[PDB]
Amino acid sequence: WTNTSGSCKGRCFELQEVGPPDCRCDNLCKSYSSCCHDFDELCLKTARGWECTKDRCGERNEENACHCSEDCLSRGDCCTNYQVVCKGESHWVDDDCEEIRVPECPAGFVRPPLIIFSVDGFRASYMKKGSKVMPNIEKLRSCGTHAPYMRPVYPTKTFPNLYTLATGLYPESHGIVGNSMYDPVFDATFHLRGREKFNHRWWGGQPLWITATKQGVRAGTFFWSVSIPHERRILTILQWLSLPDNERPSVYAFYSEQPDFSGHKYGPFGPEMTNPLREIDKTVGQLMDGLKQLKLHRCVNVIFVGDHGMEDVTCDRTEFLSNYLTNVDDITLVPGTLGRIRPKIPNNLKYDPKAIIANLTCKKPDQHFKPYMKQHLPKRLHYANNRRIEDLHLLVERRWHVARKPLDKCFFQGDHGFDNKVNSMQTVFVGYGPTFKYRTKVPPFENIELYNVMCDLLGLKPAPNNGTHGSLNHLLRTNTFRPTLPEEVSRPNYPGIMYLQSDFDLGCTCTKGSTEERHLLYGRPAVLYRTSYDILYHTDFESGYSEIFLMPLWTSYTISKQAEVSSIPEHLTNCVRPDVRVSPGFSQNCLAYKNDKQMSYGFLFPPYLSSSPEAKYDAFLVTNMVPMYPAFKRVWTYFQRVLVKKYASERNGVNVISGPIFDYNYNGLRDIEDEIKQYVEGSSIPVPTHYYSIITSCLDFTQPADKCDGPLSVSSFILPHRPDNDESCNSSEDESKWVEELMKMHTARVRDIEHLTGLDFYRKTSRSYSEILTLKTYLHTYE
Numbered sequence: 001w002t003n004t005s006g007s008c009k010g011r012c013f014e015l016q017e018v019g020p021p022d023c024r025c026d027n028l029c030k031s032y033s034s035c036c037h038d039f040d041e042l043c044l045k046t047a048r049g050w051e052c053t054k055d056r057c058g059e060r061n062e063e064n065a066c067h068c069s070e071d072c073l074s075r076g077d078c079c080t081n082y083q084v085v086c087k088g089e090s091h092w093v094d095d096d097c098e099e100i101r102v103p104e105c106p107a108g109f110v111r112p113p114l115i116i117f118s119v120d121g122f123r124a125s126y127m128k129k130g131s132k133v134m135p136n137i138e139k140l141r142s143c144g145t146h147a148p149y150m151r152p153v154y155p156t157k158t159f160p161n162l163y164t165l166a167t168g169l170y171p172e173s174h175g176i177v178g179n180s181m182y183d184p185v186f187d188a189t190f191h192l193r194g195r196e197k198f199n200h201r202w203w204g205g206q207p208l209w210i211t212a213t214k215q216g217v218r219a220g221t222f223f224w225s226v227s228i229p230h231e232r233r234i235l236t237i238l239q240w241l242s243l244p245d246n247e248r249p250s251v252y253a254f255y256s257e258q259p260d261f262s263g264h265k266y267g268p269f270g271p272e273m274t275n276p277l278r279e280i281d282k283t284v285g286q287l288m289d290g291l292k293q294l295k296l297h298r299c300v301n302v303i304f305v306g307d308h309g310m311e312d313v314t315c316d317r318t319e320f321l322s323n324y325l326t327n328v329d330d331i332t333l334v335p336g337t338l339g340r341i342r343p344k345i346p347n348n349l350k351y352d353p354k355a356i357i358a359n360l361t362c363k364k365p366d367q368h369f370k371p372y373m374k375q376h377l378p379k380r381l382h383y384a385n386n387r388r389i390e391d392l393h394l395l396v397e398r399r400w401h402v403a404r405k406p407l408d409k410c411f412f413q414g415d416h417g418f419d420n421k422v423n424s425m426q427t428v429f430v431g432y433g434p435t436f437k438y439r440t441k442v443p444p445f446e447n448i449e450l451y452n453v454m455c456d457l458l459g460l461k462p463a464p465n466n467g468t469h470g471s472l473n474h475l476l477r478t479n480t481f482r483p484t485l486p487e488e489v490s491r492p493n494y495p496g497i498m499y500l501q502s503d504f505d506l507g508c509t510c511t512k513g514s515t516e517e518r519h520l521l522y523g524r525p526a527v528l529y530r531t532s533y534d535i536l537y538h539t540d541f542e543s544g545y546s547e548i549f550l551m552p553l554w555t556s557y558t559i560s561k562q563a564e565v566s567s568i569p570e571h572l573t574n575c576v577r578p579d580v581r582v583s584p585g586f587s588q589n590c591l592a593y594k595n596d597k598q599m600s601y602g603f604l605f606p607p608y609l610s611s612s613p614e615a616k617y618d619a620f621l622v623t624n625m626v627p628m629y630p631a632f633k634r635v636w637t638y639f640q641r642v643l644v645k646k647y648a649s650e651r652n653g654v655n656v657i658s659g660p661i662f663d664y665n666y667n668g669l670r671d672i673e674d675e676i677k678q679y680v681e682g683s684s685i686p687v688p689t690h691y692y693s694i695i696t697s698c699l700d701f702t703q704p705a706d707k708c709d710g711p712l713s714v715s716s717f718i719l720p721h722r723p724d725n726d727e728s729c730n731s732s733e734d735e736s737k738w739v740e741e742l743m744k745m746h747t748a749r750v751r752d753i754e755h756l757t758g759l760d761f762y763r764k765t766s767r768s769y770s771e772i773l774t775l776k777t778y779l780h781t782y783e
């Protein structure tokens with residue numbers, strides 16, 4: 001029970017959230033039906049609007065939404081344009097950009113406050129409109145630090161992305177995996193409407209306001225109800241900034257439901273989009289004018305950030321499951337720009353997922369969605385390790401929708417939620433203030449990295465998250481994080497020739513300085529876990545061979561622009577040779593591959609790229625072979641025989657690092673021995689879930705990859721090791737029509753491979769460690 005007979009006089013939007021029986025006056029009191037009786041009258045006043053006019057200058061009526069009185073500067077409740085209209089001051093946007101070398105804060109401000117100004121559905125390309133439509137935002141962008149775009153997380157929806165911005169976590173870790181979700185342990189559904197979202201049980205990880213409070217830094221509200229106009233949200237933030245030193249927060253958030261609302265109705269390029277964009281710019285202007293009025297415009301760090309973009313999507317572009325499935329009444333579909341399927345009744349014995357996927361696979365030539373069991377989704381989405389993510393997922397093609405049946409002019413022209421590499425899904429990032437760099441453009445980056453930066457801007461230690469601390473140090477003038485190189489746990493063994501050909505009963509038949517200088521360009525990768533492994537040198541490649549997995553953890557080799565591709569001679573087709581540096585007890589065997597009728601093998605260093613016939617014999621060593629399904633070999637052989645040479649010709653040589661990945665529990669992390677669920681028949685040779693490659697070259701392509709003096713250029717992938725090519729609808733055609741498209745879909749960051757393998761790359765370069773961390777977060781999108 002709450003005593004609603006109390007008053008909100010002198011308490012409007014207070015930060016101390018009182019509990020029952022005291023009535024509330026904070027911004028969230030309406031959601032819990034606990035506001036005091038006069039909260040709407042005293043705190044949500046709108047009389048005379050939000051702007052001072054000439055006739056209003058010089059007195060005071062408490063009924064006014066904001067004031068134009070001489071005492072309003074002391075009270076901290078002027079309308080944001082008061083100084084401009086009444087005291088001959090200029091608007092912030094009309095003032096020239098002046099570098100902020102150090103924080104210029106009034107007395108009592110120990111650190112520069114942070115204001116996060118978040119905009120829903122603000123597509124990156126909206127920034128190209130410029131100062132014609134958005135001058136305040138253009139001033140922040142050109143004067144501060146900006147990226148051409150920021151990558152959101154998948155699904156590219158509001159709730160997963162705002163919570164990722166707050167925690168630095170992937171949605172699978174923070175638990176907000178969609179705007180709608182069913183949790184089978186709670187036996188409950190979370191939805192935008194409804195009370196379920198208010199229960200803390202859904203919200204995992206540690207959001208910024210909690211990180212701040214636990215470390216003694218105060219926070220303003222990060223949740224604004226729709227019954228509070230934007231002008232009042234700005235005035236409330238300004239009011240809080242005027243509080244006494246022991247009460248004033250250091251971190252604030254502003255949220256706008258626009259341009260997302262108008263984007264859904266009119267499309268991202270509808271002429272109707274101009275007005276909501278100008279209204280967001282005027283809100284930014286009100287904030288900067290109010291900060292200038294407070295002498296805080298050269299003190300506060302401001303982040304202008306979006307959650308996701310917006311794409312043209314209409315009713316006319318909808319695929320229906322009833323066209324592929326006999327029974328859509330027995331399944332529940334979370335629909336739209338993604339699909340998540342589960343039986344209507346949990347654990348229904350008649351649910352046949354194998355038969356459902358089969359019916360949704362390559363059934364139409366222009367099929368505008370692709371089904372996946374969640375562990376088969378591209379690893380860069382990081383969208384599998386949560387009980388709220390249904391096993392069956394549909395990746396929807398951009399501009400399309402998926403629905404259960406036709407019943408479910410269009411009422412909408414825009415939507416979002418698609419794969420986070422889609423261009424229309426990219427959003428904005430601008431940092432402005434004393435701690436951000438001046439007039440600096442930075443490369444595009446992922447929104448999971450912002451939590452570390454916001455913690456840096458506030459002097460906070462971030463809770464464990466998925467950002468790479470130090471990868472965004474180039475955005476900041478000061479408060480950079482001093483990253484520390486991860487300690488190598490296992491030191492390599494360097495075995496010499498110790499065995500004879502006669503020591504092996506495997507059922508098989510058939511210049512270290514120069515190797516390191518040519519094929520290991522950035523030093524040996526560090527093994528960050530306890531294991532036994534051997535460095536093996538060869539003329540054409542170097543490898544880190546695992547005694548536990550019986551295969552390389554990594555294989556490193558350089559292919560120059562003028563390297564020649566050769567064929568495997570007919571007499572060497574089935575050649576596998578024992579390695580006299582590795583014990584028969586620590587080797588794979590050919591008998592297990594012959595016994596396993598579904599599993600064949602491939603090589604990490606390709607025999608096709610040997611530098612000479614004599615050197616080609618090393619490519620056939622048992623220590624260079626890895627288990628591969630014949631369907632996968634079509635992909636791997638095309639990559640090794642055609643694509644590597646193509647990349648070497650285009651990038652002026654390439655350094656390739658390839659190897660296996662074991663991620664049976666789809667958690668994005670290296671499996672321990674116990675978690676590996678498949679082995680080559682009758683053996684202890686584990687079967688990889690994926691195969692990776694990291695392809696590095698010189699950013700200045702006029703210098704060969706093996707003689708590069710400056711920054712590096714990287715592209716990587718994590719290919720699913722699957723027994724069929726069902727993901728590629730055109731895989732009956734020659735590999736030149738489908739393999740590269742499959743690889744582009746499975747593009748990856750080097751950081752994604754490090755998590756999945758327990759290895760640490762680029763340990764020996766002439767580049768700063770912060771630059772290397774940025775290179776490790778790079779994702780080549782092919783957009």
Ligand SMILES: *[C@@H]1O[C@H](CO)[C@@H](O[C@@H]2O[C@H](CO)[C@@H](O[C@@H]3O[C@H](CO[C@H]4O[C@H](CO)[C@@H](O)[C@H](O[C@H]5O[C@H](CO)[C@@H](O)[C@H](O)[C@@H]5O[C@H]5O[C@H](CO)[C@@H](O)[C@H](O)[C@@H]5O)[C@@H]4O)[C@@H](O)[C@H](O)[C@@H]3O)[C@H](O)[C@H]2NC(C)=O)[C@H](O)[C@H]1NC(C)=O
Nearest residue numbers: 172173174175203204205385386387464465466667668755
């Ligand atoms: C992205 O970054 C995150 C954060 O660093 C990494 O996630 C962490 O992974 C490690 C290793 O697997 C986990 O450690 C284990 O933790 C448990 C104890 O876990 C409890 O306590 C911690 C600490 O307070 C808490 O964070 C945990 O929170 C999880 O569970 C909550 C209840 O279900 C849930 O509300 C919350 O969202 C979160 O769920 C996620 O994690 C669990 C696994 O912990 C997972 O099953 C679920 O599906 C979600 O993904 C929890 O209350 C110890 O008993 C173990 O011994 C071990 O220490 C961390 O718990 C985990 N932290 C988070 C926040 O997820 C990711 O690996 C990294 N991803 C990549 C790809 O690098």
Ligand SMILES: Cc1nnn(Cc2cc(Cl)ccc2/C=C/C(=O)N2CCN(Cc3ccc(F)cc3)C[C@H]2C)n1
Nearest residue numbers: 116118159162163165166197198222223224253254255
């Ligand atoms: C979702 C998510 N995750 N974190 N946030 C916080 C947030 C974080 C950052 Cl980095 C920047 C800005 C914001 C602010 C967001 C915001 O004001 N709204 C309006 C209210 N609704 C509804 C609501 C949900 C749960 C509740 F308990 C109460 C209400 C959520 C959101 C759209 N939102």
Ligand SMILES: *[C@@H]1O[C@H](CO)[C@@H](O)[C@H](O)[C@H]1NC(C)=O
Nearest residue numbers: 002003004005006021022023
């Ligand atoms: C509680 O509410 C009643 C009116 O419903 C009021 O008379 C009472 O004084 C309030 N409590 C306090 C402690 O003032």
Ligand SMILES: *[C@@H]1O[C@H](CO)[C@@H](O)[C@H](O)[C@H]1NC(C)=O
Nearest residue numbers: 324325326327352355356359
């Ligand atoms: C799959 O489609 C066929 C028609 O091609 C239909 O006979 C069958 O019932 C469908 N199966 C499921 C599980 O929907």
Ligand SMILES: [Cl-]
Nearest residue numbers: 198199200203
């Ligand atoms: Cl919450």
Ligand SMILES: [Cl-]
Nearest residue numbers: 725726728731
């Ligand atoms: Cl196929």
Ligand code: NA
Nearest residue numbers: 153154381382
């Ligand atoms: Na994700």
Ligand code: NA
Nearest residue numbers: 111112113250
């Ligand atoms: Na402060």
Ligand code: NA
Nearest residue numbers: 516520524535
């Ligand atoms: Na070496």
Ligand code: NA
Nearest residue numbers: 663669670671
């Ligand atoms: Na794993």
Ligand SMILES: [Zn+2]
Nearest residue numbers: 120121158307
């Ligand atoms: Zn949104």
Ligand SMILES: [Zn+2]
Nearest residue numbers: 121260264416
């Ligand atoms: Zn939306």
